[PDB]
């Protein structure tokens, strides 16, 4: 427990990861793929006139797509300054090889427009444990994620996971 707290502190001391650019700018083809699969018929995501009638400058991206833009994709590898890598290794090494996401809270400061380029930065928050949980002994790990367009914060997320010891550990 002591060495875990010390390791977490050294990770936190590095501060948030440098902003990482989304593979693509916000774009209509990916909005199209998303609204079609989700089944969301909201016209502001596909019709300029409808978007303008709702007060937007033109078609806007669904707010809930914010994390989609910055997904790593097939075979993607996190940057060398992502604090999650070291945290996952730390807990795996201590036997907490299981993982589950428990809570995700997203805040959207404004709607994004096609053509806007988003970046993502991640910061480690609370690391709490060891706790007895219904899945086994574990530690909860929080992260604060911020998305920007240029230097402007456009969305943020508090992400919480549980790293736990599986039944046979």
């Amino acid at each position: 427990v002591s060495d875990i707290q010390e390791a977490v502190a050294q990770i936190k001391a590095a501060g948030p990861s440098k902003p990482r650019l989304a593979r693509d700018p916000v774009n209509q083809p990916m909005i199209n793929n998303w609204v079609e699969a989700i089944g969301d018929r909201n016209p502001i995501y596909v019709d300029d006139a409808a978007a303008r009638a709702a007060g937007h400058p033109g078609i806007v991206a669904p707010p809930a797509m914010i994390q989609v833009w910055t997904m790593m994709g097939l075979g993607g590898v996190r940057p060398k300054d992502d604090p999650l890598g070291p945290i996952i290794k730390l807990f795996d090494d201590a036997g907490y090889i299981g993982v589950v996401a428990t809570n995700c809270e997203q805040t959207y400061h404004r709607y994004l427009l096609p053509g806007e380029q988003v970046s993502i930065s991640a910061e480690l928050g609370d690391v709490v444990g060891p706790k007895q949980t219904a899945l086994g002994e574990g530690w909860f790990i929080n992260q604060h994620i911020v998305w920007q367009v240029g230097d402007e914060d456009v969305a943020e997320m508090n992400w919480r996971i549980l790293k736990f010891k599986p039944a046979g550990s």
């Binding site: 089944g39 969301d40 909201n42 707010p63 809930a64 809570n103 959207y108």
Partner: protein, 126 residues
């Protein structure tokens, strides 16, 4: 202004494999558990299951279906519950829990055969 206690129309969604796979990949989530049954089962799960980004999108859709295209979504908070596996149906229900100066808070729950799949708090303007 809507009011506290107002209820949203129910939405029932069948989790066929096409739904689960297409939503996961449209959210650019290539984790094997959302499209590879053998890998889901390999890890001790029952079958492929809906991912978290799809939950966020469906909660958004559910609320805007009710509030309309002029609704502005300000936040979505999720507490993750039981899995939504292939062939299960999730029923979404919702109730307005707060109204604070133009800002509406809605509590949304998606339930399936296994229990509460997702519990969400959505803040929006209307």
């Amino acid at each position: 202004m809507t009011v506290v206690g107002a209820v949203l129309p129910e939405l029932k969604l069948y989790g066929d494999p096409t739904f689960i796979v297409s939503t996961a990949l449209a959210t650019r989530d290539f984790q094997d558990v959302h499209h590879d049954r053998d890998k889901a089962v390999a890890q001790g799960s029952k079958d492929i299951f809906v991912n978290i980004l799809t939950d966020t999108g469906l909660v958004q859709r559910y609320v805007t279906d009710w509030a309309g295209p002029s609704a502005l979504i300000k936040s979505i908070g999720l507490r993750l519950g039981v899995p939504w596996y292939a062939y299960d149906t999730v029923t979404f229900s919702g109730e307005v829990t707060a109204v604070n100066d133009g800002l509406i808070t809605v509590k949304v729950v998606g339930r399936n055969t296994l229990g509460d799949h997702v519990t969400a708090t959505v803040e929006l303007s209307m």
